[PDB]
């Protein structure tokens, strides 16, 4: 009787996880937060490589790295806590005492970092037509709502597909509205800056586009092959891999690029 719990638990409570499935998910989750802390050191140490007016970028990246590190750390410990090795069957099964696994830790992280990552770009690029304050608010309203909704939905990823997908959809709505506004910003930013700067913003968009799309992919990860192929421990491994890749990208790499764009203008 799990209830509204993540499908990792249902997998752990029945089939269990193999050494490879458990270990990899464990390592990939550790790598996640180890990367975040490394990223922090990088942003701080490179604060003096850019002018004074672009530094609020590096700062926000650093703030995000911290936030991320703590929650990705909690998340990794949640994984290892919630699944124990069964010596008589050689598999890792749900361990009631260590609490049920939940990705909500990561989600609420987003609630902090999304608004940060979308806002910090406004400190490097200048807006031609659109208004700083307005673009920000939209980013923040859509950003928050996008997570709050998705956060709510993922609870029902097994106990209720309908609610799962409805919320997932309402979330998706706001998602595109961010993409829209971002593309808008990227352009107005390319207006009046060295080709080098322009090239960097372009690569930032590709990165922002791919990475941010991976998230909803992981949100559905379990069903992307209808009790198919990804409704198993393979689906769990995949989901966490994507998540970790997504974070490293949409945070660290994203921030690095913005740091270079800040130097190109500096």
């Amino acid at each position: 009787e799990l209830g509204n719990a993540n499908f990792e638990n249902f997998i752990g409570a029945t089939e269990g996880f193999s050494e490879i499935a458990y270990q990899f998910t464990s390592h990939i989750l550790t790598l996640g937060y180890a990367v975040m802390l490394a990223g922090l050191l990088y942003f701080i140490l490179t604060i003096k490589n850019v002018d004074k007016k672009f530094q609020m970028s590096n700062i926000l990246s650093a703030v995000v790295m911290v936030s991320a590190f703590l929650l990705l750390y909690a998340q990794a410990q949640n994984w290892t806590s919630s699944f124990t090795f069964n010596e008589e069957v050689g598999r890792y099964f749900l361990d009631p005492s260590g609490d049920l696994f939940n990705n909500g830790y990561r989600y609420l992280n987003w609630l902090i970092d999304v608004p940060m990552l979308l806002f910090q770009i406004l400190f490097v690029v200048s807006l031609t037509t659109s208004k700083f304050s307005s673009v920000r608010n939209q980013f923040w309203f859509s950003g928050a709502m996008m997570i709050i909704t998705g956060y709510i939905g993922q609870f029902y990823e097994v106990s209720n597909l309908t609610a799962f997908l409805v919320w997932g959809a309402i979330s998706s709505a706001f998602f595109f509205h961010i993409l829209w506004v971002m593309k808008k910003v990227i352009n107005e930013g390319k207006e009046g800056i060295s080709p080098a700067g322009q090239k960097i913003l372009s690569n930032i968009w590709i990165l922002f586009l791919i990475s941010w799309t991976l998230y909803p992919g992981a949100y559905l990860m379990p069903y992307l092959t209808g009790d198919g192929f990804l409704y198993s421990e393979d689906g769990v491994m995949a989901r966490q891999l994507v998540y970790t890749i997504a974070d490293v990208s949409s945070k660290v790499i994203y921030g690095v690029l913005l740091g270079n764009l800040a130097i190109t203008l500096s």
Copy 2:
């Protein structure tokens, strides 16, 4: 079980128990809480040279509060996760005696340090007119401590004895009004003799300070805010913990930022 003078969370967790969502959300939000604090710290440290030397005590005090909050909020979080365990038979989280009872005391005492720091740091940005610096500082510190110490007491009796609960709570409320009376008196005098940019910020700092500080007494009473009503359940717990976290973030981080920003405009 026999709990005695314990917080209302423990009685819910010792009877109904907590549903996955209720327990997980509370666990998450409490984690977000202390994550934000350490992040905010990084911000306040790195934005120190963004303001004159005379205003840098503000940022410094903000950074101090951050560390303060991080440690205690961290403790308050681990107090949650360890005081409630999953029951595989009914799939709900129930009071785990060995992990110590849950108490919001860690947080309350977090304030005992910070309430003074927050009321004090604004005095390193603004300048008064008819009020003595120390005179204000003292009234803050006295009313600040008395407010918390009296509330800290009462919240031990929120379940075991409502009359004491409300009495101590009320006595605390008195000191609460006094601190508002004074802080409003301080933002007026502070607004006198400054620019238009600062004038606007402090007006924002006020409403913020107002809404966020009112939340606390709201959370204090949470359970009893709908008469065995609707909030005398796990929902009441979720609400409370959410409210605290939002507030704590606002009262120290947003608040800290607004002040730190106001120091820049100078």
Copy 3:
């Protein structure tokens, strides 16, 4: 069969601690080490605000140790007493080791010398000799702690040795108080009325705060089986120890930073 252990354990192994008693003591102890780390940040950031800066450094050195040890204490408290669902009280849990204020005490081995030796980097002595005033502070400082450290193991198993070492320790205490007075005075010489007013406030603080420790030492026996030979005695002791440590190290170091400004 406890043996030479703090009276927290005897209370915990018999009456047990009530929610309020165990929680408050647990909270106050947490606050304790929280304040230390917070302070660490303060003293590292205010270093600017050059000859005096060794003061801020030493304060920071105290903060670090304080945090690490006061933290250990808190965890020692929480892991040594467990809630009993049947009677609803926190009783001694052996597996988590017996409680002991020994962590605090050894913290003092470090902090006491530093706190004393640091004021010498702000004020300027008249006729007294820097290195001499230092050695006294250190020899006495160390002895005061080592002796009291020994005595507190007997605060229950042997009321005599407890008081003997206690008394001995108290000798070094008064000594230190004497020297520190000789420093406050010689410091007041040749500085604005502000610089003085500060050192005066430092004296009162240092006097009151440092007297709280020996009060805590006897806290159990400050009302004769009295009112303070119970959980309330444990609360009190730990409240006092935290109040002192915050005053003697943080507020203290802050006042030395302010005097370091007027100068």
Copy 4:
């Protein structure tokens, strides 16, 4: 003994168990490992200004490496101590299922970060002649990632499936010799133009880079380096973890130290 695709440490730990020396050493050597990482981190962060502004990216990258290695090598050590417990009856450390199985995985995924960094950093200290910056970088990265990933997979079969083990191992090696080649090509193109001091360092760096990195494969096969012979036991585990440590200290710390000197002698 139904372990599955697990490292040979568990197979020893669940059968013969580890003696005091064997378990303790491994435990110590692992801890020293992540201690050196945090020690070195400080060194790089404090020597940032001892080199001109264009070379500093090296110092900074080394610092980043140090942090990751710290955490993951920490996790690794905690993995070892949690996965084996003393048995009073026979005084030997045996596998403790509750504390999860042991797996060097933590260290491997460490490399995912650190291998690209260590390779990409030297390109901030030296100047190239024929081959271009980006081209060298991407071959380092692509190859680096593949090498680690194919090795990471293979080590899961170091017992359950000897073939798949050696197969991937070899596949990894391919990407390895590729990295060696492209590196010596960089060391050389680097020596060109710089003082006999910098040139002297690069020489030293190469020696290091070659040895240190060769040690990894050595660890990979540690158990099978003496056939069921002598290294299929607790000693084999000791030897492996010792090597992994020596190798990680050399490949990242000593290495980054040398790239620091080089950055100095090029100011």
Copy 5:
């Protein structure tokens, strides 16, 4: 059946540790790693109190602090976790599930710090007839051997008195060599510096000499009275170790930071 372990375990697995014996060891071990983190701060916040050419010493002192901190911390957690209170007899006995206790953590700590400590002095003083490098390699080769040889032996400090002494002896030989070299390093160090600086170098030599001697004293502790093969011997050993480590790294480092100031 413990096998090749430190006598701490044999005492804890037989006699048991009294509240005091256990609590003190626990405290002193904590104090140890606490001092290390405090020292770190000091050496960081005082880097700028000396000329650039000397600063390397401060940094190396800080490095050592970090290393020491962690490993001492581990050592502390190893002590506390390895021995549990027995409420029925009122003493602390070996808890198998917490791993056996071992000083090995500390020894491997030295495997780093020793090199750094002998090395860092070369960034303050100036030799006269010996080369910077030669002296550094003599230190390092010997410093390593001394630690490894001793690390081995301490595993047999009960199971095998012979191997214990044999390795300890072999280790000592390298110890003397380091005293010889370090002696030559201080004499040449005094050449060409104010008598004030000379005096600090003298103190340093005594500190170095005394504190570094303590270690083999601890190594043997148990057998230093054929009332020391008890819990008292354990207390003694751990106190000495801590005193030594504080002295040989912190105080040592401070005195060098002062010699850097005088020479600035």
